[model samples]
Target: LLKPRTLADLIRILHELFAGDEVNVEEVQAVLEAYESNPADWALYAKFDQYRYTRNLVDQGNGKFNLMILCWGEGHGSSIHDHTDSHCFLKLLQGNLKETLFDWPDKKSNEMIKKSERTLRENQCAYINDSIGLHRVENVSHTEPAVSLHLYSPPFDTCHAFDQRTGHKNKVTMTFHSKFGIRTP
Candidate 1:
């Protein structure tokens, strides 16, 4: 039987994997699945926010990818956004999250239609890319908070957040709530 792996172990594996000339999405998912979620292993990045979700950086992957822990308070969610040429791999670590997918904003007409929605329970994994479509994720429960692990390949520094009502988007620079378990100023 394989021994359970921790976040640290996953980091080392990812570092080596990303050093190659190319990265396979399925390989990344398999790596994430091998590491079990134990709050004790990630508690340092589990800080929550009242008004919005917090993105805590776990590993930078030598610039190949970014591994992060996102903590979401109940009822909190993201503005519909594109991945900006990156692949997003997510794993629900605790509680539940509702992911809503949307069609990309129309240029000729102001239309942003909802494609589908699904709830992600603890330990569930999902992968999305720009080709798949934009998405907004939320902590669905009124009484419980949620936490998730995310890996973004060929990491991006900025992405456009779309307005559903207007079909307009604004470029926003992303920031981390914490880096390497240290709070950022």
Candidate 2:
């Protein structure tokens, strides 16, 4: 198990792993290898899985990047949202996940929110940088649970969660409450 003594240590490690002109594949691989070796270290913070709080494993002192593990219960998923001024890489650790990727012409404004793209049954490991940051993950399998390791660069502060049907957007501040969920406000 990796014991991060302080947030600075966590950022230092992440920066070394994913800092450069391009994505550091070797560093990311090493981090994943470490995480996979000990799944219990990144367990859910609470017994329930809701928008309660986000358990941040790594918080860069300067707001550069952070690492977290999100646990999703059966039939639960995140709302359609976009990370502003932040890039994220999500890796599935356990169970199955149905990931949907979306594209919007006007990212600043909710003018045309259309599901122009989609990705289903993504069982393989993948990475998402600044380019493809807008998406959501859902648990398709009813009997099993889902867990994903998420890496956010430049650290996520405020984001816009949107409702596709109504074209309404809710500006929310990312606050960590516990190990299981995030308090969205």
Candidate 3:
């Protein structure tokens, strides 16, 4: 087990392991193992969700990919956005989360897209490949806080596609701002 002592250590290890390779089973397994052993170690990097915390395990290489631990408070969620060319995988460690997925039609406007939703409990995992890149996550349970680990390939940057309305669309460059504080208007 590679125990990272600092954020830089974690990122360096990740860079060496995942730098040029496409999504592979071994790479995914390594990440899972890292989170499985010490979920709380990442709490030091927490930023968002004042009530809770979302620690940045690794955020390097131009937001193409990143790893973070989410500790949700009574109420916390992410905006609906698309990764465009990237993919995402979320692993629940402590609590549960409600994840919603959406798709946009090629010829038709956003109004014609279809959406599906799912709830992931502890030890449950979800994957969003390039084909299915648009989605949102939320902590639905009000009684307790939820914690999970997130992995995004190519690192999340300022390249997020959002839907202003049914037929309108916009893209924003995202940065690592505080949780529940960064907003686009």
Candidate 4:
């Protein structure tokens, strides 16, 4: 069992899991479930350190997976984005996150629709491997900040993005706030 005490501990677990070179939906799901079972063992990884939200690129695993911790301030969020064929697992560490799942025409699960609504608070997790990542996420409370951890398998370099209000679509490369686990400007 993993007793994650820091970002490094979490990385060790992910590295061990992806050492097999390739992973499946169930494998990733298992990791998320295991971590969620004892979030207190790792919740400190995403602690707030700035007024603006921050992301810690904890580890990039041998080109097969990546792990990150995100700290959010009030009003922080993102627009509709798709994971470019990667399986994603997000575990909220602190506060609450508002996630709205979306559906658009021309994709596998085509059809313009708002699929589901979710509010993930501390220790709550969400998973997506298909069209399910097409959505928007934000801190549920405008009055406080939040924190969460993210894991992506077959880590994505680029993804499709959508305008939450306009519905326009486009491609965007994924960028990080840091590299080698070192925060950068």
Residue 179 lDDT (model 2): 30
The lDDT of each candidate is: 0.88, 0.56, 0.62, 0.70
TM-score, prediction 3: 0.67
Predicted candidate 4 versus true structure: per-residue lDDT over 5-65, tens digit per residue? 5445666777777778567566655556555434454454454554456666766787778
Q: Provide TM-scores for the models.
A: 0.94, 0.66, 0.67, 0.78
Write candidate 1's Cα lDDT for 53-119 as tens digits. 9999998898889999999998999989988988899998899999999988778558677899999
- For candidate 3, give the lDDT of residue 5: 59
Give the TM-score (vs. native) of candidate 2.
0.66
- List the lowest-lDDT window of 10 residues for candidate 1: 1-10
Compared with the true structure, model 1 gives a TM-score of 0.94
Error of 2 at 17 (Å): 2.3
**In candidate 2, which residue ranges exceed 4 Å CA deviation?**
1-15, 18-37, 44-47, 50-62, 105-124, 179-185
- Which candidate leads in lDDT? 1
Clash-forming residue pairs, model 2 = 45-179, 52-182, 53-181, 53-182, 54-181, 54-182, 64-154
Clashing pairs in 1: none
Decide which is better by lDDT, 2 or 4.
4
Arranged by lDDT with the best first, the candidates are: 1, 4, 3, 2
- Please count the clashing residue pairs in each candidate, in the order shown: 0, 7, 9, 0
Better of 1 and 4 by TM-score: 1
lDDT of 2 at 173: 83
| Cα lDDT tens digits for candidate 2, 1-185 | 25344323444666665555455655564455344323454444333445421344534524456676565677877777787756666666577667666664444555435454444322234555436645667775668776666677667767877676554668988755443243433
Give candidate 3 regions above 4 Å deviation.
Answer: 1-16, 25-39, 51-64, 106-114, 164-167, 177-185
